[PDB]
Homo-oligomer: 335 residues x 4
């Protein structure tokens, strides 16, 4: 059977095809984020008018379904078709990970605890340098945007793709969007902790990496972070909503990152997101949510989704545990 | 015959107790404002430490319930007891009105279209003057805060209790909170219009009032508005969140105004809010929302609630329609 | 023949060259916007690190001058030069015009008074359409950003190059930066008002629009075939060509060929009342060239007034002259 | 016996009165903060039309003078009466101190480095507790507004009278205004370290001391000041003082309302000092308005409002010098 150690349900049948057109999905009650789904869609209308035009009828259809009852048994009653996904094992288990938008403090000039530079997009040959070399000073100081008080925060923000920069002087939070990356492949840092016997395999998470950095010295932290030759460059947007690859403001848990080749942007997705406590342990229950694919990821390929948790600490704690599975139905309207 | 033109529903029977302990509420699905409610709780937590301290048990219970997918049936596992309100008709149906926070365009000094003063709290004897007298100049110019471009906007804001003031110069919107009122009783203008013979009986709305003001001249608008001797004074909070009587930042459609004697502040309320189109016509469907009583009103007494729609024009259009009914349950703890 | 209405000077003599190095400028005394200038300096540091690197010396040179005091007679003790610019009449009268960042209210969807679209950058062939054609609907609705309540406001913002958009719903003001323009040359509106004779400034044109009907206003505005496209920066500071946040009356638009960006300029800006009449007195200010303009060529500057109505009233009247010195480091 | 190390002078002559009508001010230069001064008048015109309504006569005179060049040699041509103040030494030099509005980062709930509570106005009997007792938990947790990451920052903000609170979550900076104080007299930590023999006082030097020593050592030192200030959140409102008028950086000062009432225009020779707070020897001409008060600001003494932020704090902590000042009024 499918060990539910990471949330693997099997109460639907046996659907192997990519888009398994089921009559109506397995679920009790209405989705938890109905009104929240409306906001997400509204953003698609103003931020991507061409993407909205292609999915107008789809969005308008599910809205009435939510305003009437919301039960996954009253979908076809409005011409909505649920196309279940095969997932990993092809039995019905789609991978679910998570990411958020962290807020970090920094200064325009280095001072005191602020000695860690955040770089912008450099020239063609400047993007060749690895993370370790950049730490040593491979890039010119004119490409620095700010200096943070934590090398770990910069690394986490690097992994997330973006983040708000708080200068702590009164000015609004500047959104440092994903502008580009260096010519080096991304390599797992948490794995390096397991390679030398520093962190447990079963107890691998966001809090473990952060706790490790506080337990060890700066030299030991820098050495570990350098094991990831990849480095991300940002572009200041100045208090703009969190936007992904689709250039549409992402809403907390109402949007996900996907493989554009399989699941294109603007795709409505209803899924059973597995719940977990503060310790990230799978309790056994799920959560019905309506989300839209509006972002991409280097590690997000095939039957895999990256649920956008939100902005802030609480959104980060919730995002670090997500490496579970669950079912998902691609919602399409009848022609 | 049982009226259903407004938005009444008779199927849960007649309730004798002001609060009938019904296990599972007659909900259509799940809370569509999980994020709005959670936000509202966090606002009470940081703005009203003692009010939150007492209702914290309920707040943590309903949030954990919302986490479980917001299952209106499984909420009993969390010990959440639903006490359905008897309603104004004792059939579970309760009156639902609405108010919002209008954004008024103004200037510090009178110029061009900006010739309508917004006053602050004057001395004891200055608060005796009626609206008509204040329009003629009963108050000193040193009590003026700003000059708007519409007498109708000032009147609507007066009725709402507060509103944001946009100076259109780059500076943030200043929140003019309810500071006080004059020594004259309030008299509805909607009644005056019907009785005057201009506006029709059933064809009354806050929209028709705004349209009427644009159809008629300044002298005709002023004369009509003077039929309401009451006048509200404001106090600029300088870009502060919209706060009500409880001094807690109000969240759009996640908070309501109530009679503190019957429904005290901090009370969690799950309700079936009747939906209505752009023309304010009751289509027939409802909406499940979790709201908290955090404000009061002069016309809000007994079995009656004033749903805080939000900030802006869209929030105003949605607010100036509500004179309908719907079911509501007062969420509490064990008996 | 020999006017002094626009603040023209003669008390300096003819200038035989564009820039003349003096010793103690003919200015009044101490600058008023010493603080605003400092705010402009760090803005260049944060925004354009390359520009701040080449002019770091100049910014710090004048930084010590104002720190102590700010007397125009004594500047050499801080290592500063004073290259006095000439003018049209060659008497040091540098032309000073003005522009600001207007705040226009609008919604995402057309409703009521909001029926005037604000467009973004369309494709290559979509940029060929003239203003009159775009008004009639030459561009697709998917290129619309917002709908304003005034066609005149959209036109003024079009002329200014940018503007803040207030959606009146609580959300922050979205800065619609200059993204591009259409394939048509700019035509003057006052020009058309002279043809049939009806009227002069940005204040006189605004009054004309209020006096005449919508059909008469649209017809006049269509006389300018040029149309500007914007790009929402989502609540970002007002930036010009140099991509540096502009500070009110502490920055100006110039001809990059003559006066390159990052150049410090101390000038005697001619004052004027609410009616735009030159009273006779000047104002000493320190400003930096951080923007450009299509009509800003040669010995001419466009003083950035600021954001809002008051900044617009002040900018619409500005078409006067004044002296200006290019502050550089002593060799 | 005439000191000059702290900015004091003698080229003005000894005074016989607090204020004296001077036909021509003994100071060369021009108001280098004319823009900041004009900004203050607009703030007094919007935030307090009552005080402005009776102080306009002086502003209109100092504005007409400013617009018409701004040369101190023509002030009488606009109706501006200069009044030389004696200060500490009857030679025209007044004691100039400074304060600013610190931006502190804090959270609504205690977590990690954020373990230092910022309290609001408690009941009558709750205001009796001293700082040391409050640190130990004399006040209930329901009176806490936020938890900062530095006990020193809280102390400095306490001395300043107010400060902006940055929650680092996106929300605007909340201005914690001076709501009240406890029933204990203020004791400067400066006098403590001066007597202890650990000074090279400098209110910023103590900041370095706090970072050098541990939490227990910092708390112990701070407990020497029994006074404790309570704040009131205004949520992104301009820095306002006692006059309830938004203060402008170095264009406003705190004064003794009995001697120098609020709304009073003051032109002064503010003594300049380097990064190390050493008096170089030069001054600075500034136009300022009295719009705030202070417990230690009595008689011939002013507290120059430096501004908001770190740089404003470094500049403020050094001020303990002297300089000449003229009370600008109208000519009868
Ligand atoms: C040891 C170990 O392995 N532990 C595991 C741990 O790693 C796991 O944690 C999670 O890991 C995953 C994978 O490592 C992390 O995944 C992140 O996912 C996010 C979102 O999916 C990624 O961020 C997005 O990245 C894409 C690029 O791939 C961005 O897309 C780009 O967007 C820009 C605009 O910003 C586009 O540029 C614009 O282009 C237009 C058109 O050409 C042009 O006009 C504009 O000018 C231009 N704008 C600019 C500024 O240039 C660009 O075209 C587009 N690129 C593409 C290809 O479309 C997107 O914007 C990013 N989204 C946001 C938001 O910023 C992120 O890259 C990815 N990281 C990695 C390393 O892959 C995940 O973050 C992480 N989560 C957490 C909490 O740590 C955990 C799981 O919990 O498991 C452990 O076992
Ligand atoms: C025929 C029919 O059915 N017609 C329908 C029509 O009625 C509907 O339209 C709606 O009508 C209703 C009724 O006319 C309108 O109701 C409005 O509701 C709002 C919110 O409930 C009211 O605004 C609140 O008013 C209360 C006072 O009553 C305010 O509370 C005060 O708050 C201040 C602080 O702001 C407190 O002062 C502070 O006190 C503390 C402690 O003492 C002190 O320390 C502070 O210093 C001090 N602060 C200051 C600044 O002084 C004060 O104590 C407290 N007062 C009390 C008693 O507690 C509260 O703040 C207001 N809320 C907000 C937000 O501002 C409003 O007054 C009320 N209007 C009227 C006329 O009663 C409703 O607005 C309207 N809606 C619309 C859209 O028009 C329509 C709707 O569709 O349907 C028709 O069918
Ligand atoms: C009858 C009569 O004549 N009456 C008089 C009346 O006309 C007078 O009114 C005044 O009129 C004048 C002239 O009509 C108005 O002048 C305006 O002046 C402003 C400021 O100088 C101009 O706005 C600037 O325009 C330039 C382009 O010309 C903009 O520069 C561009 O900036 C963008 C970024 O925003 C750059 O793009 C970026 O490029 C980088 C690098 O390649 C790339 O990486 C980025 O991605 C890219 N970003 C984007 C978004 O694309 C671009 O490269 C650059 N262009 C160049 C060439 O460098 C600049 O940003 C604008 N500034 C601002 C701020 O937006 C404006 O164009 C100009 N209007 C006209 C029609 O020429 C003046 O405004 C007006 N004043 C008033 C008050 O009405 C009155 C005087 O009051 O007197 C009557 O008598
Ligand atoms: C060894 C040694 O001596 N070393 C030196 C060292 O000491 C020096 O450091 C400096 O020390 C001095 C003195 O200790 C510090 O001076 C500070 O100065 C500031 C400004 O002058 C003071 O802050 C103001 O305090 C007043 C009260 O005194 C506040 O005024 C109150 O404002 C509130 C509103 O906020 C009013 O309440 C309102 O009232 C109305 C009407 O009744 C009501 O309607 C409202 O509801 C109500 N609002 C509320 C919220 O309740 C209230 O009425 C009014 N009070 C009065 C009496 O009018 C004012 O708001 C504060 N200003 C700001 C801004 O907040 C501060 O108290 C004072 N500190 C002390 C300890 O006295 C100075 O800060 C310090 N500087 C530094 C850098 O440390 C250094 C200097 O370099 O030199 C060493 O040598």
């Amino acid at each position: 059977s499918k060990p539910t150690d990471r949330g693997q349900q099997y109460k639907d049948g046996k659907f192997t095809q990519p888009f398994s057109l089921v009559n109506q999905p397995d679920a009790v009650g209405a989705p938890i984020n109905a009104g929240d789904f409306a906001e997400q869609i509204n953003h698609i209308r103003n931020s991507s008018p061409r993407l909205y035009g292609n999915q107008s009828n789809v969005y308008n259809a599910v809205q009435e379904w939510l305003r009437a009852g919301g039960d996954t048994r009253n979908m076809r009653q409005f011409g909505i078709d649920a196309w279940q996904m095969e997932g990993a094992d092809n039995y019905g288990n789609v991978q679910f990970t998570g990411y958020y938008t962290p807020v970090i403090q920094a200064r325009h000039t280095r001072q005191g605890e602020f000695q860690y530079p955040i770089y912008r997009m450099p020239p063609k040959r400047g993007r060749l340098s690895s993370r370790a070399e950049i730490y040593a000073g491979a890039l010119s100081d004119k490409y620095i945007l700010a200096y943070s008080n934590s090398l770990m925060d910069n690394f986490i923000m690097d992994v997330q793709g973006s983040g708000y920069i708080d200068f702590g002087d009164g000015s609004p939070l500047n959104f440092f969007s994903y502008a580009g990356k260096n010519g080096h492949a991304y390599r797992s840092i948490g794995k390096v902790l397991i390679d030398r016997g520093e962190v447990k395999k079963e107890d691998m998470s966001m809090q473990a990496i952060r706790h490790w950095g506080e337990t060890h010295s700066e030299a030991e932290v820098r050495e570990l972070l350098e094991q990831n030759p990849s480095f991300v460059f940002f572009k200041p947007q100045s208090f703009a909503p969190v936007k992904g690859a689709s250039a549409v403001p992402l809403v907390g848990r109402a949007s996900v990152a996907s493989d554009r080749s399989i699941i294109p942007p603007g795709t409505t997705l209803i899924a059973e997101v597995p719940l977990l406590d503060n310790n990230g342990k799978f309790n056994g229950q799920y959560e019905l949510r309506l989300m839209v694919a509006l972002d991409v990821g280097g590690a997000i390929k095939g039957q895999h989704f990256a649920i956008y948790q939100g902005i802030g600490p609480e959104a980060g704690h919730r995002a670090g545990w997500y490496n579970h599975y669950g079912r998902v139905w691609v919602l399409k309207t009848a022609p």
